[PDB]
Design a protein around this ligand. Structure first.
Ligand code: ZN
Ligand code: ZN
Lengths: 91, 91
């Protein structure tokens, strides 16, 4: 269970990297697909008993949603705090 | 079933005001209770078929958790984003 959670955190970090890559362009289906994936990941975290990592996954989902729908000036701050929390959680 | 969503959004706005009040007096026993309530409300929103409102509720939860831990500068930004989105969604 511990390794599953650590590996899912690594997966969320990779998805966040891909989200930034898609935001630096006009990709609009990648953001929707990653939002779906990250929502599933947050549900898996909340079934695993962890609630502070599910919050990180849902925060990345929120930032992807924000950048998908026009406002791409506040998604960056969400990105920063999301990476911070994820890195604190992994180690 | 739409009036329920509107009233729950109003309740989440009241909880946001309560959290903003509880921050400036170093509370630690009300922030955890509000985090619990807001997580329950986010689950209700998820089971009610609304994801954008659940994201706002969980954003308020994340800001409350950040204030609880000790980080209070990004918590304010999270509050602004959640408040703005709830203000859009209460109409
Ligand atoms: Zn979502
Ligand atoms: Zn929580």
């Amino acid at each position: 269970k511990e390794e599953v959670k650590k590996l899912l955190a690594k997966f969320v970090l990779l998805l966040l990297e891909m989200v930034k890559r898609a935001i630096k362009k006009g990709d609009k289906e990648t953001l929707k697909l990653i939002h779906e994936i990250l929502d599933i990941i947050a549900e898996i975290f909340e079934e695993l008993g962890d609630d502070e990592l599910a919050h990180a996954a849902r925060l990345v989902s929120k930032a992807a949603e924000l950048a998908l729908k026009g406002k791409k000036e506040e998604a960056e701050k969400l990105f920063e705090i999301a990476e911070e929390e994820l890195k604190e959680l992994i180690e």
